[PDB]
Design a protein around this ligand. Structure first.
Ligand SMILES: *[C@@H]1O[C@H](CO)[C@@H](O[C@@H]2O[C@H](CO)[C@@H](O)[C@H](O)[C@H]2NC(C)=O)[C@H](O)[C@H]1NC(C)=O
Ligand code: NAG
Length: 536
């Protein structure tokens, strides 16, 4: 008789509870009156009187559960009421406990593959529906199995085969068979991460891959410039979506973490979807959180000296009273070498690790820290040891020490050491032999025509007396330099004796600072060599 009308809904057929929905009856013949039928019954009637148009609206504001069901549209032209538009199933979510949807292994799927998702729910007699967020809505319906241990009803969906052209976003629903038009509120969006075949995004970690706990860090995913959304993922276990990306320079998907915890460490990969579909995943960037296991801090030492000559063998010692599995050295903020198995020494009650370095390339110069961690948690490290710094000399002119303020000192005289050189080094390093610390200062350009470095030590005590050496380096250079002749600092007033012989060794010095005392007169001993006491 007459052209069957077209019934449309906004928003979609599956609407969340308590939201406004609108039906639209459309035709071209005429518009005398429109009628909306709900489940085979006259629900509403809109007349084109009191503005004249060709399409009629039916608003159902504040939708509740009772508004779910079949809807048809009929119209009348002249005095002919004509048939029905093909029915439209309005579905309302709510009334139930929210189901859970879990990527059974991981959301990761190489294109053309299937992933299994488990959908759980507490409801006794319920069917499960898995839908994907796409144009032509893909659905799957399963019966619920019951896990007697967890006392929960679950069903598994094998969603696939996953095509690399379309973004896959899965959601689950639970619903009673007897009332099909009423589903549960949708579970959390499970988005599948597809390993495409386009170029790989470079993944980066700006502050570093090693981060102390509770601190901030950022993960960048830069790559193809026809990319739209960047993802970060962990083997165990994360999903993160970035839509708003820095366009300058080029698509840079930024991720920000305010404070690092246990659940932020692990191996990260960057997945990416774009106009030409998905891309091959990034390299596995391993994020490491330290500061955890903050009870037993490891301790780091070095032998034979914190400063070794170029081309020598030198061992670092990572030790801890706690039975860690492995110890790892880090230079600056970066990992160094690899992990070594801990080794329980029977004598020192310690767990030991000997990082042997030989020969010493100028690359080993830096600040080392040893961490302890366990096998089952490779990304959760201990609290860093007190730093042990390494200097490596060998290849430049030996920068002599001025050694002013005298050569033999009495507590307490403000001792300062100057380290000069003919070669214009941009930085000098002073070291007291047998010590663990190395001092460094920016050299100042004196008028004469070279650089002098000021090393202001504290008040002279009995402990400040020893042997000193200075080293020189440039700005662009990572190579430190061979040290000068040893400076022997001698301290007085450290023995209850006054010499009258002018006791293994005997010292003799001028009232003025001589270039070197020979071995007023002073008296020392072979064991405690740098300690003296006299009056003449
Ligand atoms: C580097 O250290 C020397 C210390 O020898 C400083 O020299 C002072 O110089 C004044 C005159 O210029 C002398 O009267 C003082 O006796 C010196 N100090 C001492 C402790 O002897 C020099 O100023 C320092 N230079 C820089 C750039 O810090
Ligand atoms: C170990 O280092 C020392 C000095 O650094 C060197 O003389 C010695 O030859 C090294 N050991 C071996 C086996 O070469």
């Amino acid at each position: 008789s007459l052209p069957k009308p077209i019934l449309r809904v906004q928003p979609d057929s599956v609407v969340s509870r308590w939201t406004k929905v609108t039906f639209f009856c459309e035709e071209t013949i005429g518009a005398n009156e429109y009628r909306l039928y709900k489940d085979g019954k006259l629900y509403k009637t809109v007349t084109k009187n009191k503005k004249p148009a060709n399409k009629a609206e039916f608003s159902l504001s504040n939708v509740d559960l009772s508004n779910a069901g079949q809807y048809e549209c009929s119209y009348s032209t002249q005095y002919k009421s004509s048939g029905y538009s093909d029915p439209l199933k309005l579905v309302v979510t709510g009334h139930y406990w929210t189901p859970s949807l879990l990527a059974q292994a991981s959301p990761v799927v190489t294109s053309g593959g299937y992933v299994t998702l488990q959908c759980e729910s507490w409801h006794n007699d319920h069917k499960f529906i898995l839908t994907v967020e796409g144009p032509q809505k893909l659905s799957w319906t399963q019966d619920s199995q019951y896990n007697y241990s967890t006392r929960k009803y679950h069903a598994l969906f094998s969603v696939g085969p996953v095509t690399p052209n379309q973004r896959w976003i899965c959601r689950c629903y639970s619903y009673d068979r007897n009332r099909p038009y009423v589903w549960s509120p949708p579970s959390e969006s499970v988005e599948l991460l597809v390993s495409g075949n386009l170029q790989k995004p470079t993944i980066k970690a700006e502050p570093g891959s090693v981060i102390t706990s509770k601190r901030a860090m950022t993960i960048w995913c830069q790559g193809n410039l026809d990319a739209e959304v960047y993802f970060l993922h962990n083997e165990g276990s994360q999903k993160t979506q970035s839509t708003q990306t820095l366009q300058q320079p080029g698509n840079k998907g930024k991720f920000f973490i305010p404070s690092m915890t246990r659940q932020h460490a692990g191996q990260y990969r960057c997945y990416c979807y774009g106009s030409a579909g998905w891309s091959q995943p990034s390299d596995t960037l391993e994020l490491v959180v330290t500061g955890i296991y903050e009870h037993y801090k490891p301790r780091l030492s070095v032998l034979p000296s914190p400063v070794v000559t170029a081309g020598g063998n030198m061992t670092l010692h990572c030790a801890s009273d706690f039975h860690y599995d492995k110890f790892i050295l880090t230079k600056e903020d970066k990992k160094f070498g690899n992990s070594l198995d801990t080794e329980h020494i029977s004598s020192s009650r310690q767990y030991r690790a000997l990082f042997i370095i030989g020969p010493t390339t100028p690359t080993h110069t830096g600040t080392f820290r040893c961490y302890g961690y366990f096998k089952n948690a490779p990304q959760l490290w201990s609290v860093p040891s007190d730093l042990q710094q390494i200097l490596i000399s060998g290849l430049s002119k030996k920068p002599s020490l001025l050694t002013h303020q005298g050569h033999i000192l009495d507590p307490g005289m403000t001792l300062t050491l100057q380290c000069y050189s003919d070669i214009n080094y941009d930085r000098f390093a002073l070291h007291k032999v047998g010590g663990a610390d190395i001092m460094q200062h920016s050299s100042q350009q004196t008028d004469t025509g070279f650089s002098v470095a000021n090393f202001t030590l504290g008040y002279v005590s009995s402990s400040t007396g020893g042997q000193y050496r200075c080293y020189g380096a440039h700005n662009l250079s990572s190579e430190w330099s061979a040290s000068s002749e040893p400076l022997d600092i001698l301290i007085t007033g450290q023995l209850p004796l006054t010499p009258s012989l002018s006791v293994d060794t005997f010292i003799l010095s001028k009232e003025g600072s001589a270039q070197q005392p020979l071995r007023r007169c002073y008296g020392a001993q072979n064991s405690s060599f740098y300690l003296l006491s006299s009056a003449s």
